[PDB]
Design a protein around this ligand. Structure first.
Ligand SMILES: CC(C)C[C@H](NC(=O)[C@@H](O)[C@H](N)Cc1ccccc1)C(=O)O
Ligand SMILES: CC(C)C[C@H](NC(=O)[C@@H](O)[C@H](N)Cc1ccccc1)C(=O)O
Ligand SMILES: CC(C)C[C@H](NC(=O)[C@@H](O)[C@H](N)Cc1ccccc1)C(=O)O
Ligand SMILES: [K+]
Ligand SMILES: [K+]
Ligand SMILES: [K+]
Ligand SMILES: [Mn+2]
Ligand SMILES: [Mn+2]
Ligand SMILES: [Mn+2]
Ligand SMILES: [Zn+2]
Ligand SMILES: [Zn+2]
Ligand SMILES: [Zn+2]
Lengths: 497, 497, 497
């Protein structure tokens, strides 16, 4: 979809559908009032009949009105006078998009300048949310359908704002477009089934990306290299499968050569059966999303490439497929990690932290200013924070604060959990330097504690996206693309953009 | 056992054991009375003592009686002066057989003409049930025992009937003998353990059968052929095992060249672990019977060959072994079926419908007049219809009705369940054309619905024999041979025999 | 909502909203075409723009059109030019009703004569389904909401038909209105929470209904009466609770004095905890619907009273509340039923068949021509037939067939399951005449088998509505009102109405 910004009057714009807001009690703001006046009162005449109560997202669609250049006018409810919260604003926009998707109009004009959004400026923050919702809402994954989604008529949307706000709306659209393009890439990789989307496939995706971008260099480390580097934990996860593991490095040099890089580490478990500690059958298909950490790193990188941010960004994708077999890791195996710390693998279904720990040690070589790991790590995080909020831990309160602030401004929120030293003992092993599980109490936190033992060389944060990375059921089952908005926001903030 | 029919007087017949019926209140029918008189009232005299109440299947065994040529007389209770139901009649016969098997007599004569069986003619229907119970009751599967069953003395049974009915009893014996010989083959294949009875073994069985019979042509399609035909669902089931899959085609051309064939499709999962969606351990051994669909097709074919029915019969055995491994199918995999329809494999333990759907597409080439699939498909069918009655679904009312009627006449009953369109949606997938599971509601029906999407080219029915194909425990644990009687009866009906 | 029928031309009717169908490819039937012409081609002109593809239930709403007397015109998609199935037709009607409910129009005119419905005549069967969907869709249960549903503007719908069809449409409306009114009563009783809706409450409801209807006499039997009649199974169920049981008799004498009555027996377990055989907590709230058998009998009676059918109808509501306590029935208890047959209560959560068996014996006194029990009886029925189809068993083929045919014509379908004698032994007890459970195989059937032992005196059928009586979750959670349509249709059939 093409998304552009103009400052012309709403009544003057030639379009298939003009969209304007209407409050409860048929209350029209200055923009809608001017459109009503151009229609010689036709809009307020229809509103007087009472079909539209004006609750947020309710709609009334009109056809050709004399005095207007729009072929259709869509009235959308904006609710009571009170400013809208983020969720209500995004639902309003999605309601609009749903109607437009079903029409045979080639373009539409949104004239929603009068709608106030709580704690967001009328031009940048408000439109960041609208644009991302509109563009991400175009997403289709019909690759495996014999009957394809018939393409939609809607090819273009124009946002109307005042002259003074136009540049800021354009900046919101630029940023939202990069984020939505990155999210589409994330969502495609998440939604791909695990018989196709395995570690070698992700390596090929990375190599393709490297060829397409001059400032990107890609290196792929195979199973032998992982083993030779001393990555005993990463190797142990992957060995059970016929699909070998891959550590994928994507190095974007957008900053000055001397600038310390930001490192994103993504968990790329392409399918998590649990291994010998096998999962139950119910809902196991959703473990194709266990590479959503790696997918979100791909999508964040793709947003960064689109924006050409002037930062050095090193992406490390720790990819393996966790399968039961006659050569799989067993509960009770002890391995030596790249750091030299030994790990007793008490449960082979706590495998993400194993590929991550070795990759955290690998990251030391880049001499980073921040290392953020993203992983669908714990069912415990869904118990703690549910579907709405990513769990966040780290070893630097300034980094943790920056990620929280980015998630608030991006409306892709996270929430800090503590890594108090008292939780560490839960990982104690009588045999090895640590075990890989902490028991049934504080599961999200003990997984963060385990990772923290490998992150002492740098400023580090860990994002547990087990609850935010996909929707489990209903019509909308599938990858969400989170946390691409938070991560991209954090990088925009570090770039000063 | 040799089973013959004669029309001589019971008192006159030289035999190790003469069997005659006695009612309650010591009441003797015409046949029994004649034997009593020949015995000089000896039988009445013993009855007066009251040891035999005459309830169905009760017995009293006499030794040499003056005036008879029989060495022993077995009296068997026939109940009150009303006709017996099928179950009571078959139990009476089994009771008699159990006594004879324990004796050292080389033959026996059954003189049970006076016993009425409800809704069964005195010559054909009555003796179809008797002869099949007698012959199937001889079944022994002692090949894995170090101590073999002491072979039995009983080598021959003669059924006495009146002259007028002799040919119809002979026709019942001909048909029952073919059915029982088919059932023995089915039972042996089901009872064989899965380390021996794998898809390659079944292929060798088919090849051996092909060499033994001129009107039979056998082709075996291996794993690469299955893959190269585009059978993505069948291939997915078999990949996880070290034993590769086989699609076995047995083509019997007994009809006219231009007569459309009847196609039988059998599920041949030689062991069902569930795969990655692994089953619980308890009772898993009974999943060696997950090839009883394919076994019943082999047994029906053996009966048809014995009878030389004048029909074209194509048998398709879809054989694979469902194992967990590092190369097995995962929940969430999406495959392209031979038909081009895509399937999301949400649960790798819903595997029978996957090998079946591709085999249903394969069956289109034969331009059949009926396609019947037989499969141990759903635990839900045991919840719905239990151990007694096979679940039946289809896309043609006439075919379904023919199979029901065959089951009633063969005393191997089925019962229809509806494939209403409302159940289809339970198979919807957001990614593929369908998923392979429908959830906890209507599981037998949604499996039928899944298969129906591959059967639209022809008249089709599906038989879920999960409850009727074997007995789980007790002294009689093992394959039953069902539904060989129903299927054979259906083909006798189509042949006009 | 008032529902009336007229034979005036669609373009001529003064109304807030005129509803007409449009096919795919903008194809207009005779009625829609005549409206288009009166609108001076306005409707064709809007359709040419392509916003409405015409798939069943899609909508496009127009405002005031020159040449018409309708204030609004709703175009509704009717699909390709083939007849619609029942489900598609009812979903089309619900789509229309949804739009109308959100408008501020006091009335609407449905001009849907053009639309063909498969296997149902243009006037009676087609409009039975439309009228019931429209009227049942008006249902609101907001008693426990602090914020009430806003009263809807829509008060009247007019159906247009040709003069020749008017009588038959009016008959359909009369019957659908009775059915919908009965369903609303059923749904209210089902949706009441169990702290309010207990057996004494249902007894009050029945007494109040008796006072309002001349031809209705109501008797209520309390716990002591149930005990004193020798109803040891019914008494055993209710004894654990602080709410005592009630057996409610509602006798409608609408037939000739010497006509044998139809008896409906409803399970009225107002809450089923399982008792000492306690249920799991998950979903237990839905056991407030365990009196939906009884609720559907009240609803059917309400429909019969509205229609004044000329039949004698005796309703027996077997009401109890199944609770654990220090005085509750135990697994292993043996009780003497009213019939004198003893029952070993192996599981106290098989309680509905216990209150039903004693009520089936009580029904003998009426010398009925048919006895139908309706009960939310088995989870196994949901496994067998899911949410779409009621399970049906019986001891009379004619009665079973009549109920099946009623279900088809009412679009409230049932499906027969067999009560073969082989399933009876599953109920054997070493101690009593029978146990109340048959094990994990054929649960729906063994429950019907249990009941059949109490129904030998008369023609009897059993409806297991465990899957059809309510919706478990989502926006539409709550009672369905089924099987009031099937039961009312059966009584219409017996009355000759
Ligand atoms: C063994 C445990 C300590 C850890 C275990 N974690 C895992 O299995 C992770 O690898 C899972 N990928 C976490 C998960 C499970 C379900 C939904 C979303 C995310 C878990 O159950 O949380
Ligand atoms: C995963 C489910 C949708 C289907 C699943 N079906 C199976 O596993 C079939 O392959 C089984 N072969 C069915 C079965 C299980 C136990 C006894 C007899 C038959 C079942 O549990 O019924
Ligand atoms: C103990 C078993 C033989 C019978 C048991 N039946 C019951 O508990 C019935 O009283 C329940 N009212 C049946 C039920 C359970 C869940 C949803 C709908 C209907 C059941 O589990 O089906
Ligand atoms: K994936
Ligand atoms: K076997
Ligand atoms: K209730
Ligand atoms: Mn895991
Ligand atoms: Mn299986
Ligand atoms: Mn219960
Ligand atoms: Zn994982
Ligand atoms: Zn199976
Ligand atoms: Zn109950």
């Amino acid at each position: 979809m093409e998304l552009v910004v103009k400052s012309v009057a709403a009544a003057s714009v030639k379009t298939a559908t003009l969209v304007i807001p209407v409050g409860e009690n048929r209350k029209l703001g200055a923009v809608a009032k001017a459109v009503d006046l151009a229609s010689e009162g036709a809009i307020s005449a229809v509103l007087k009949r009472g079909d539209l109560a004006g609750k947020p997202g309710q709609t009334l669609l009109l056809q050709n009105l004399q005095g207007l250049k729009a072929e259709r006018v869509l009235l959308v409810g904006s609710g009571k006078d009170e400013a809208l919260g983020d969720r209500t604003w995004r639902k309003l926009v999605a309601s609009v998009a749903g109607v437009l998707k079903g029409l045979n109009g080639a373009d539409a004009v949104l004239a929603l300048d009068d709608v106030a959004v709580n704690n967001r400026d009328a031009h940048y923050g408000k439109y960041r949310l609208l644009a991302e919702t509109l563009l991400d809402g175009e997403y289709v994954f019909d690759r495996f359908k014999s009957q394809k989604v018939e393409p939609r008529a809607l090819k273009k949307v124009t946002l109307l704002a005042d002259k003074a706000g136009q540049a800021e709306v354009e900046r919101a659209v630029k940023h939202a477009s990069a984020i939505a393009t990155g999210m589409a890439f994330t969502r495609d990789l998440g939604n791909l089934p695990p018989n196709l989307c395995h570690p070698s496939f992700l390596a090929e995706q990375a190599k393709e990306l490297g060829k397409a971008h001059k400032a990107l260099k890609v290196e792929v480390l195979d199973e032998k290299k992982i083993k030779d580097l001393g990555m005993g934990a990463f190797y142990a996860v992957g060995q059970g499968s016929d699909q070998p593991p891959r550590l994928i490095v994507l190095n974007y040099q957008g900053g000055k050569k001397a600038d310390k890089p930001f490192v994103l580490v993504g968990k790329g478990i392409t399918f998590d059966t649990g291994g010998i500690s096998l999962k139950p059958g119910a809902g196991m298909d959703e473990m194709k999303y266990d590479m959503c950490g790696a997918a979100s790193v791909f999508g964040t990188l793709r947003a960064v490439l689109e924006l050409q941010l002037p930062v050095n960004l090193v992406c490390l994708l720790a990819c393996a497929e966790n399968m039961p077999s006659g050569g799989a890791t067993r509960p009770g195996d002890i391995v030596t990690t790249m750091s030299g710390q030994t790990v007793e693998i008490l449960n082979t279904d706590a495998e993400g932290r194993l590929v991550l720990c070795d990759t955290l040690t690998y990251a030391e070589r880049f001499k980073p200013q921040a290392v953020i790991d993203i992983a669908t790590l714990t069912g415990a995080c869904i118990v703690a924070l549910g579907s709405h909020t990513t769990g966040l831990m780290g070893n630097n309160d300034d980094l943790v604060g920056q990620l929280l602030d980015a998630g608030k401004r991006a409306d892709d929120r996270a929430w800090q959990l503590p890594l108090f030293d008292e939780y560490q003992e839960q990982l104690d092993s009588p045999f090895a330097d640590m075990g890989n599980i902490g028991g049934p109490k504080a599961g999200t936190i003990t997984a963060g504690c385990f990772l923290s033992r490998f992150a002492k060389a740098y400023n580090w944060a860990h994002m547990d996206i087990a609850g935010t990375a996909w929707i489990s059921g209903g019509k909308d089952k599938g990858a969400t693309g989170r946390p691409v908005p938070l991560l991209t926001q954090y990088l925009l903030d570090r770039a000063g953009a």
